[PDB]
């Protein structure tokens, strides 16, 4: 209620709650947090740009191929993380605003 601006509003409540009876040894009460803020795009966006800028001059690869790795597989993993990055970027700021199952019909004249 204090903010919706940092919560995904098209998931009506983003929250899963639980309350166990027993605290950790030497403590009175506690909580564990596990979250997914779309901010996490930056992580992977770092990794897949840092990858691509070394790969664009083939640096270090000789050590990789030496264990018979395939040179095509770099291109594939970095492409897959660019799809994964794009996934957060498109679901960030995505619509709570509604759209209906209704098509264009030629039912009127011009006025």
């Amino acid at each position: 209620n204090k903010n919706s601006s940092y919560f995904v509003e098209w998931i009506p409540n983003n929250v899963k709650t639980a309350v166990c009876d027993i605290p950790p040894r030497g403590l009175k009460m506690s909580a564990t947090f596990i979250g997914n803020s779309t901010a996490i795009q930056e992580l992977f966006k770092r990794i897949s740009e840092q990858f691509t800028a070394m790969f664009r001059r083939k640096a270090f690869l000789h050590w990789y191929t030496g264990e018979g790795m395939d040179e095509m597989e770099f291109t594939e993993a970095e492409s897959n993380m660019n799809d994964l990055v794009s996934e957060y970027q498109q679901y960030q700021d995505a619509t709570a605003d509604e759209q209906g199952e209704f098509e264009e019909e030629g039912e009127e004249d011009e006025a």
Binding site: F55, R56, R57, K58
Partner: protein
Amino acid sequence: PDLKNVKSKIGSTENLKHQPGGGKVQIINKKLDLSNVQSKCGSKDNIK
């Protein structure tokens, strides 16, 4: 008593043309060829 102007015996007669002169040296060397060169530590295809 006239001796008839007696000549010497026997002198440096084999040296009368001698100096002697010097030979020549010119060293001077050829360039090696280093035109078989290319770098490997970059990219020529994956840059595209």
